[PDB]
Design a protein around this nucleic acid. Structure first.
Lengths: 42, 600
DNA sequence: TTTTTT
């Protein structure tokens, strides 16, 4: 099943950056459900 | 469980290696993780690792089956530094019957602390004793932070993402693992996280950044995955956090933020309270659920549409627009008392001179004494812009201290990415609810191309109104401005100011132009005239429609702008045709003006 | 730093 160490953590960063993404209108799918936060809701 | 007997029997044995090994230079051995990742082994994206699927446990999903673990669930960003695993729930009775405890991968020993708990402390030591680990370069807090983060992450993982994850992450081994990971990075090779890298005035400050909100009302906490500072929020962000449209654990991405507090070479996270990360609404926004905290690949400002934007929410790092209409200059005076005075050119020439004549009167008198102070006026250029592809309330962008050539650079009907513009409220009888685009020293402009057809969709060049339309109540044109051509039939200019000028077209339709300024002159009846930028207005002379003449207004008796001619020389026709026009005109006015059947 | 009319 799914490895758990080759998985690119949403945080393992690269030295310097060189080695859509934002929701247009503020108030108004991949944006609505934040993982880390789904936690506080439960 | 076990017995306190065979406990200090590795605790007081542990400290041994601490000392004895700290009495030398160690052998830094890369941990598990670090090496794995470093390998040639194919890697996975949470994205893919979940099948382009995003979180489905909305306030408790009914299927705890998968692997519950009420020993995590009750974890939240705040209680992640606490925690402590229960050496009894995740084990059984295995290597716990002896006097060793638990050796959790990579090497090193964890001392399943007394009461049956293993948390913060333990692992710190259980780290110090781990191969290649030199507890001489670390603290029990530095590991209090990293503990926290990691935990939190994991916890989640299970939650929202179970059909792929479970208690496969809450394994102090797994845990102690990254814990080690961190070491090999932040230390071994010394690659500083975003924050840590910036809170150390070492890498370009708050430019692009994706962070996750860690804590909460005065202000809130943001983390890059490694450390967390407190952000300084502006009015509308507040109004979000307040409304709950932004909650801990959500990821945002900001732009050109700024570092308030300690303008000194600040130590890695763990400083005062004076520092803060100031982030402005119009510079930050919601990020996609994965997104990878830290800095960000392309730093070059992300464009937004005007459609959003708050008056109160700082500069728009950038907008891509089309310049609907460009305008005539302006001169502005800060009267000693504060007040501002807008002036047309051939209108701040008059006053311009008025001063001169009196300035003059001053010296005349200064020396009729020795012998026998200035004006705060500045220039401004305003133009009407719109977010590129789409519909919006148009925006009024104003460049102060304009510039010789620039008049001929930003034009009407062209496309521009304007980088760095301050945003403010509208305040202008003529546009009340909207926002203001104001260029700064920072600002810069880019002209991008546009397709003839994408053009004709967004834009709307200028065109000389038909007259007819003005009677109709269905004429709700753009923001209310219009341009026109007609011949002057009469100039009523009563003292109790605000002159009117009636013009008529070739079909004898009239309109009056209430003047908010002084009559450009040349404005005698029988004259061909071309007004530009007239405001619209309800009505006036019982019957005939009105148009107001602005500081931004324009008139000419000899127009060059092409959009007029089709109606100008169209007008020239009746004009030149006869004279009995300049006369049919009166008839009408007088007629209109006096009504169908007055006391004849 | 941003304003007007019978």
């Amino acid at each position: 099943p799914v490895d758990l160490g080759l998985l690119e953590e949403d945080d393992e960063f690269e030295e310097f950056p060189a080695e859509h993404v934002w929701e247009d209108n503020w108030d108004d799918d991949d944006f609505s459900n934040q993982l880390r936060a789904e936690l506080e809701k439960h | 469980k076990d017995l306190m007997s065979s406990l200090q029997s590795a605790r007081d044995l542990q400290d041994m290696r601490i000392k004895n090994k700290e009495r030398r230079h160690l052998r830094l051995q890369p941990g598990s993780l670090y090496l794995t990742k470093s390998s040639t082994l194919p890697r996975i994206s949470l994205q893919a690792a979940v099948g382009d699927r995003a979180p489905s446990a909305c306030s408790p999903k009914q299927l705890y089956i998968y692997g519950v673990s009420k020993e995590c669930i009750n974890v939240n960003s705040k209680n992640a530094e606490y925690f402590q695993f229960d050496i009894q729930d995740h084990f059984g009775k295995e290597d716990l019957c002896a006097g060793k405890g638990f050796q959790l991968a990579d090497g090193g020993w964890l001392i399943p602390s007394n009461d049956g708990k293993a948390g913060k402390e333990e692992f710190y030591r259980a780290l110090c004793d781990t191969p290649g680990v030199d507890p001489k370069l670390i603290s029990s807090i530095w590991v209090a932070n990293h503990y926290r983060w990691i935990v939190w992450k994991l916890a989640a993982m299970e939650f929202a993402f179970p059909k792929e994850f479970a208690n496969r992450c809450l394994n102090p081994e797994r845990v102690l693992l990254q814990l080690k990971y961190r070491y090999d990075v932040e230390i071994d090779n010394s690659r500083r996280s975003a924050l840590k890298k910036i809170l150390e005035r070492d890498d370009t400050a708050a430019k692009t950044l994706v962070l996750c909100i860690s804590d909460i009302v005065d202000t809130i906490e943001l983390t890059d995955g490694w450390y967390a500072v407190r952000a300084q929020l502006d009015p509308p962000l507040m109004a979000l956090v307040k409304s709950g449209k932004l909650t801990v654990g959500q990821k945002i991405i900001t732009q050109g933020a700024e570092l308030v507090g300690s303008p000194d070479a600040c130590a890695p996270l763990e400083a005062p309270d004076s520092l803060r990360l100031k982030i402005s609404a119009n510079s930050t926004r919601p990020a996609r659920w994965h997104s990878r905290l830290g800095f960000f690949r392309d730093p070059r400002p992300f464009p937004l549409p005007l459609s959003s934007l708050f008056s109160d929410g700082g500069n728009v790092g950038c907008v891509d627009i089309i310049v609907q209409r460009v305008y005539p200059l302006q001169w502005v005076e800060k009267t000693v008392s504060g007040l501002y005075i807008f002036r047309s050119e051939r209108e701040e020439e008059k006053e311009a001179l008025r001063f001169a004549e009196a300035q003059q009167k001053k010296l005349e008198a200064l020396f009729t004494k020795v012998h026998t102070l200035s004006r705060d006026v500045t220039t401004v250029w305003k133009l009407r812009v719109t977010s590129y592809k789409k519909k919006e309330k148009s925006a009024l962008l104003s460049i102060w201290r304009p510039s010789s050539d620039l008049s001929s650079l930003l034009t009407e009907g062209k496309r521009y990415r304007i980088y760095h513009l301050a945003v403010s409220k509208s305040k202008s009888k003529f546009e009340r609810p909207s926002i203001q685009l104001t260029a700064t020293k920072r600002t810069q402009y880019q002209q991008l191309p546009v397709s003839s057809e994408t053009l004709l969709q967004v834009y709307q060049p200028r065109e000389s109104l038909h007259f007819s339309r003005l009677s109709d109540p269905a004429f709700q044109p753009p923001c209310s401005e219009v341009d026109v051509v007609g011949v002057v039939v009469s100039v009523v200019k009563p003292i109790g100011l605000a002159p009117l000028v009636y013009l008529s077209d070739e079909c004898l339709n009239l309109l009056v132009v209430k003047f908010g300024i002084d009559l450009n002159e040349d404005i005698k009846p029988r004259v061909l005239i071309a007004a530009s930028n007239l405001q619209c207005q309800p009505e006036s002379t019982s019957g005939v429609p009105t148009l107001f003449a602005c500081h931004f207004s324009i008139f000419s008796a000899s127009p060059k702008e092409a959009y007029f001619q089709e109606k100008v020389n169209n007008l020239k026709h009746a004009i030149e045709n006869i004279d009995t026009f300049y006369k049919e005109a009166e008839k009408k006015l007088i007629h209109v003006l006096e009504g169908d059947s007055p006391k004849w």
